[PDB]
Amino acid sequence: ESADLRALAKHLYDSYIKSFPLTKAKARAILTGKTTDKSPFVIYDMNSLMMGEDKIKFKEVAIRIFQGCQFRSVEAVQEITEYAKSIPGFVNLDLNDQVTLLKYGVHEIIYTMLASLMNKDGVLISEGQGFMTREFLKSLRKPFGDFMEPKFEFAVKFNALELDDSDLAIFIAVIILSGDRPGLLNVKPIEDIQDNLLQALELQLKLNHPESSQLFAKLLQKMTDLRQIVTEHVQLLQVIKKTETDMSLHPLLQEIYKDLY
């Protein structure tokens, strides 16, 4: 039934709104300057970073920035976890499988949602209270600079798809419920949940993007691309805490990356 598929899409969207403070709609309302509340503080260099410390936080710089990305990711993992628990059937899955789905899915989701806060010139940080330029981040000394850039590279391509929060809510759910993650114990229940979410995504895209028949197929490929994107991320990261003495990694992040073959 198509009616139930729309009810599901709406349920996911509502849960998405409850789990993620800054939505793509609100992000772009700020990015384009259509909002009335205080625009974000722009950080484009060492000097500006220093000045905006109080407006974003409630080689020491490159490391300082890296640390910021770590704290945001930790927060993001928790927000995504709350979202996952709202997907029908998820909390009833074997608990270790839930852990596995999150372990291999969080970073792909982080990349996806990160795009919502980015444009070609920069990224919104601190719930939209700050804006750090892409060129400033890309200029960070090795190997940090090449750690930031790929996220923008992906975002530019992904945002060309013009998905909205309603599209994204289902897209993210589909990714989390991937029955082929390494080490899953009970595959079938996960595959059945995903099959239904995929049908929900297909209908959502057909109705919401009537003039772009290729969208569903492209998102499926994007899901495959995200895995390759995440592997490269994990590598470049394991070389930082491998070539930077002064580099501590948050426990939660160490857990996710550990044994992430």
């Binding site: 928790q78 628990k85 608990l95 839930q98 852990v99 999150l102 372990k103 939660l252 857990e255």
Partner: peptide, 11 residues
């Protein structure tokens, strides 16, 4: 993965 475990069970 006890941390992910804990987050999955709270709330």
């Amino acid at each position: 993965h006890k941390i992910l475990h804990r987050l999955l069970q709270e709330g």
